[PDB]
Amino acid sequence: LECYSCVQKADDGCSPNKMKTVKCAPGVDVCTEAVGAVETIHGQFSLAVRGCGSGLPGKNDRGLDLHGLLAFIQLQQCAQDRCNAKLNLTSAYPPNGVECYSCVGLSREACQGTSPPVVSCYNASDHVYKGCFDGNVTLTAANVTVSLPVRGCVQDEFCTRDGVTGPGFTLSGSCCQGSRCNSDLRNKTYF
Ligand SMILES: *[C@@H]1O[C@H](CO)[C@@H](O[C@@H]2O[C@H](CO)[C@@H](O)[C@H](O)[C@H]2NC(C)=O)[C@H](O)[C@H]1NC(C)=O
Ligand SMILES: *[C@@H]1O[C@H](CO)[C@@H](O)[C@H](O)[C@H]1NC(C)=O
Ligand SMILES: *[C@@H]1O[C@H](CO)[C@@H](O)[C@H](O)[C@H]1NC(C)=O
Numbered sequence: 001l002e003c004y005s006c007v008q009k010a011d012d013g014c015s016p017n018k019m020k021t022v023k024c025a026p027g028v029d030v031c032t033e034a035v036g037a038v039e040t041i042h043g044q045f046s047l048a049v050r051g052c053g054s055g056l057p058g059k060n061d062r063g064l065d066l067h068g069l070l071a072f073i074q075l076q077q078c079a080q081d082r083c084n085a086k087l088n089l090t091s092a093y094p095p096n097g098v099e100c101y102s103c104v105g106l107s108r109e110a111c112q113g114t115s116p117p118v119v120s121c122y123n124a125s126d127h128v129y130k131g132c133f134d135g136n137v138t139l140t141a142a143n144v145t146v147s148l149p150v151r152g153c154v155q156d157e158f159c160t161r162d163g164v165t166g167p168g169f170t171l172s173g174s175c176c177q178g179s180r181c182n183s184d185l186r187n188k189t190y191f
């Protein structure tokens, strides 16, 4: 069995002419395709992993909400070779007082401390967005894991080390109050 293999983070990696074709190990009968989308009130990006997989064919799709961050993950496994290229790798309010650091597809090399840009929050969809969030998104499939930082505005200022999970998927981090407080929350603690 031959499967596409590629990784997107969150960029060019699963494009047609960089997708690779690998042959699966003996006993493996499915290719895998996983695309994870994260959407904040200022932008949206996607992670993907295509590769050789395990278990039976099937589908596993879940949409999640962490304090006003939206995630959508799709996981597809099929048994015809080169079949894991079906999924898309693609998806006026007034400002309130607070401004947060925003990483929505910045590299982990690029999203650190005070380096990322600043976005003026706004209560989109009538929910109030006055917290800042520092955290991360991870996707695991085909025995590889891909992860990027996530930063932005959220409907909660008081969450500490929160998360949602989907199949091979986590979105997790911490909240804070005060403009530009999500410079670095890895120290925040606890419960
Ligand atoms: C989301 O991702 C990273 C991992 O890719 C989190 O963890 C840090 O990772 C470094 C190594 O890459 C470790 O040395 C640190 O100890 C980890 N931090 C902690 C607190 O354990 C990163 O911290 C996550 N995001 C947030 C906001 O915590
Ligand atoms: C996503 O899929 C739809 C069909 O389901 C297609 O019309 C659309 O062009 C796709 N998006 C991209 C960016 O290719
Ligand atoms: C949104 O926040 C602003 C603060 O700039 C406030 O005036 C407004 O009432 C808030 N909206 C809701 C629905 O709470």
Ligand SMILES: *[C@@H]1O[C@H](CO)[C@@H](O)[C@H](O)[C@H]1NC(C)=O
Residues within 6 Å of the ligand: 143
């Ligand atoms: C998964 O990847 C790790 C690191 O490359 C490797 O050590 C391990 O053998 C792999 N396992 C499978 C089942 O592919």
